[PDB]
Amino acid sequence: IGLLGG
Amino acid sequence: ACPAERSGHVAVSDGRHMFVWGGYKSFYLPREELWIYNMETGRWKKINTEGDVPPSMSGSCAVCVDRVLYLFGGHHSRGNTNKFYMLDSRSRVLQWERIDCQGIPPSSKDKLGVWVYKNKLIFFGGYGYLPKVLGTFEFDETSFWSHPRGWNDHVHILDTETFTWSQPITTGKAPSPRAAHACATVGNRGFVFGGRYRDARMNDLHYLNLDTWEWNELIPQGICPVGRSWHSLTPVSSDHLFLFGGFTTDKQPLSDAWTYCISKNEWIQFNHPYTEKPRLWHTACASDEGEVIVFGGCANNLLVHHRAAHSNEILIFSV
Numbered sequence A: 001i002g003l004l005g006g
Numbered sequence B: 001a002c003p004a005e006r007s008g009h010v011a012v013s014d015g016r017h018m019f020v021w022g023g024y025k026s027f028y029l030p031r032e033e034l035w036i037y038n039m040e041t042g043r044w045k046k047i048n049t050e051g052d053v054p055p056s057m058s059g060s061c062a063v064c065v066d067r068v069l070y071l072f073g074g075h076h077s078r079g080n081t082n083k084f085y086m087l088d089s090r091s092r093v094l095q096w097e098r099i100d101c102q103g104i105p106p107s108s109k110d111k112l113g114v115w116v117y118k119n120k121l122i123f124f125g126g127y128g129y130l131p132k133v134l135g136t137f138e139f140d141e142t143s144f145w146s147h148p149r150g151w152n153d154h155v156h157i158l159d160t161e162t163f164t165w166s167q168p169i170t171t172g173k174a175p176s177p178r179a180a181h182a183c184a185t186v187g188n189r190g191f192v193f194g195g196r197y198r199d200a201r202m203n204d205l206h207y208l209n210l211d212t213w214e215w216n217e218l219i220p221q222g223i224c225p226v227g228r229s230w231h232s233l234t235p236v237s238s239d240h241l242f243l244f245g246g247f248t249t250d251k252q253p254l255s256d257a258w259t260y261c262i263s264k265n266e267w268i269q270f271n272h273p274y275t276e277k278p279r280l281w282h283t284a285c286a287s288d289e290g291e292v293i294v295f296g297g298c299a300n301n302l303l304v305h306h307r308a309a310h311s312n313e314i315l316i317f318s319v
Helices: none
Strands: B010-013 B017-021 B033-038 B044-048 B061-065 B068-076 B079-088 B095-098 B113-117 B120-124 B137-139 B150-152 B155-159 B164-166 B182-186 B189-197 B200-209 B214-218 B232-235 B240-244 B257-261 B266-270 B283-286 B291-295 B314-318
Touching (some): B010 B283, B017 B291, B068 B120, B189 B240, B240 B283, B240 B291
Antiparallel strands (some): B033 B044, B061 B068, B113 B120, B155 B164, B182 B189, B200 B214, B240 B257
């Protein structure tokens, strides 16, 4: 979800 | 009388009261809930907000300027936003306001950072959709496998005088695109450290001059912290930035604390009682007394969602 790209 | 466990929330402060909003656990925390933490006593207080309540989000970017809360971007149930909210926390029961800003906003994104300088809110980096903008965007190929997303090195000013977006012309070697970096401001210097870009979680340190808009890479003498993202970077003096936690390239959860000495241009590993408590996507806020309050975040690899250990702990570093 918002997890991506970190 | 205790906030629910969460990562990817926001925490901001006036040095005495810490405000905490949003994030997620194991989905999202209630959008209308604003948890307040008194730094001197150690108790909590939850208030329901009204108005233009922003959606429940993770990876939002937030600041407090003179007890007024500002919020930008983040990721909700339907993706990233570039909506900007303020919330006056001096007032009545609190009310959110969504500011329809003038000028060209940043692209919709999360996991960025901001510097406060005078009348200006200065945002850097992030992860979100493709941006006619100043800077570079870089797709994350894994997001193609919907809407594909990626990292940027964009710098964006929101001048709170007229609530107008703009972009400064910067000189120098700007950091690469990145997200889940950490930003910190001392005087007119906007420090950014670490972050994820492509296939690394990095250890590089830069600062942007917020007067001259000159980007400077800093190269400290000797040992530097390991590369990381989802870490917190906190000014604790006019001369020291306090770094804690985060997540390495090799997916290690971090519990080491350091201070970056600005005058000395040197890192100093800070020893503390919380070495069994690694954190990531937590928040940090300085107290007026002289502390850094770590709240929340996850203890292990949050990318393993069904095993994630999200936390509601307060860690207190005497810096």
